[PDB]
């Protein structure tokens, strides 16, 4: 299955992201994450919940769709409460094992939240080195916050089970997965806790990286 990982990467910028994908001691930020805002800087809305930078937790992503393998570099991780790897396929859903060589090959990331369906959201990285994430749709609850995670404080009914859209389990916690420090290099200092989620009655024992 390792062949199914899209692998189109140029790094003409010399960002350094290409090396981090392969060798552990080449890992990539504190300057740029100062745009992320704590949950307390937003404002409560108790109107009934309707549905609406990628490394900030308060990213509002559009719902996942099918994306061309052309623009994908590295593995693609989709998240139920737990992590899962999505590979390349053709437009009919059949797996393609050619390292993303074909222009036709695509990654089917379309999401319907569990328990009903598949995953809360997905992360990948495009070819220029930028982390990209989809999921949701996020929740609409100068400081408005469109909830992508478990925003219990700003709206009680906004929980990860209800409003989850990606790896962020709470505004301060993201799921730990093997390539977490590649997509979110700035979560390096995070402390790791063994956590447990109950979504639809299935126990999701996983590890979580938190602040």
């Amino acid at each position, epitope marked *: 299955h390792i062949n199914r*990982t899209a*692998l189109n990467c140029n790094d003409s910028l010399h960002t350094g992201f*290409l090396a981090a994908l*392969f*060798y*552990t001691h*080449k890992f990539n930020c504190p300057e740029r994450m100062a745009h992320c805002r704590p949950i307390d800087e937003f404002a409560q809305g108790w109107g009934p919940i309707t549905y609406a930078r990628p490394y900030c937790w308060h990213y509002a992503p559009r719902q996942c769709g099918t994306i061309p393998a052309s623009q994908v570099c590295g593995p693609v991780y989709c998240f139920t409460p737990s992590p899962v790897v999505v590979g390349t396929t053709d437009r009919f859903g059949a797996p393609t094992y050619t390292w993303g*060589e074909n222009e036709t090959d695509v990654l089917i990331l379309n999401n319907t939240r569990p328990p009903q369906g598949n995953w809360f959201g997905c992360t990948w990285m495009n070819s220029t080195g930028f982390t990209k994430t989809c999921g949701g749709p996020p929740c609409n609850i100068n400081n408005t916050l469109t909830c992508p995670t478990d925003c219990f404080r700003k709206h009680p009914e906004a929980t990860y089970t209800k409003c989850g859209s990606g790896p962020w389990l709470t505004p301060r916690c993201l799921v730990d997965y*093997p390539y977490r420090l590649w997509h979110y290099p700035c979560t390096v200092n995070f402390t790791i806790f063994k956590v447990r989620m109950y979504v639809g009655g299935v126990e999701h024992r996983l590890n979580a990286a938190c602040n």
Partner: antibody
């Protein structure tokens, strides 16, 4: 089950350029790096760098910087080495080696696939 | 520019003995350390990869060890025509590159 086929033994006038070839069995290289190692008559194994065909990333060793160039296509069977401004010191045997690389996740270092060698003699 | 210094340069032994070769490194090394032999006129042969794992076909005589900056190859019950030149080797770093030892000659003791 991967095999490599290298260029034939060549003889080049001193101060010219020579291009040696390296072609792989299993369709194209992928996630794998194609590295070059030379050996002058009697001496040790002296690496030169390589190219990683999927990305285009060139690696040049310090002993050969500027006259050697590594080329390959993203999904071609063949990777190239050109060495320009040859002297008699360059008279040697050149190997290409296909390997998989990584330290970290899905991609770990596997593979040692060598070509059969390409003798290049440098004389007028 | 990791620089594998290999010693001895020449080892003078006779069959039946234990041949030990060392390779020290200018820096630490991420496993994936390899040992090769080369007979005259023939291309190098892989003996041990990943510091200790024996390649396919390699007799149990050849043993690998090491970690960090210091690695040794252990040849037990030296048999005839285990006598050749030997190279230590490392794979890694970015951009991915090869570093080889300078070499070691096993000759027949006289």
């Amino acid at each position: 089950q991967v095999q490599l086929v290298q260029s034939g033994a060549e003889v080049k006038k001193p101060g010219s350029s020579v291009k040696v070839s390296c072609t792989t069995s299993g369709g194209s290289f992928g996630r794998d790096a194609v590295s070059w190692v030379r050996q002058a008559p009697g001496q040790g194994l002296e690496p030169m760098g390589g190219i990683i065909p999927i990305f285009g990333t060139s690696s040049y060793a310090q002993t050969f910087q500027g006259r050697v160039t590594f080329t390959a296509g993203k999904s071609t069977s063949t990777a190239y080495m050109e060495l320009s401004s040859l002297k008699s010191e360059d008279t040697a045997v050149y190997y290409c080696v296909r390997w998989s690389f990584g330290d970290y996740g899905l991609f770990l270092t596997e593979g040692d696939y060598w070509g059969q060698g390409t003798l290049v003699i440098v004389s007028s | 520019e990791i620089v594998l210094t290999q010693s001895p340069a020449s080892l003078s032994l006779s069959p039946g003995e234990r041949a030990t070769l060392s390779c020290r490194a200018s820096q630490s090394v991420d496993k994936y350390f390899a040992w090769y032999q080369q007979k005259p006129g023939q291309a190098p042969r892989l003996l041990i990869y990943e510091t200790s794992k024996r390649a396919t076909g390699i007799p149990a005589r050849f043993s690998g060890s090491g970690s960090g900056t210091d690695f040794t190859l252990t040849i037990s019950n030296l048999e005839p025509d285990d006598f050749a030149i030997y190279y230590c080797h490392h794979r890694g770093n970015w951009p991915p590159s090869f570093t080889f030892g300078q070499g070691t000659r096993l000759e027949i003791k006289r």
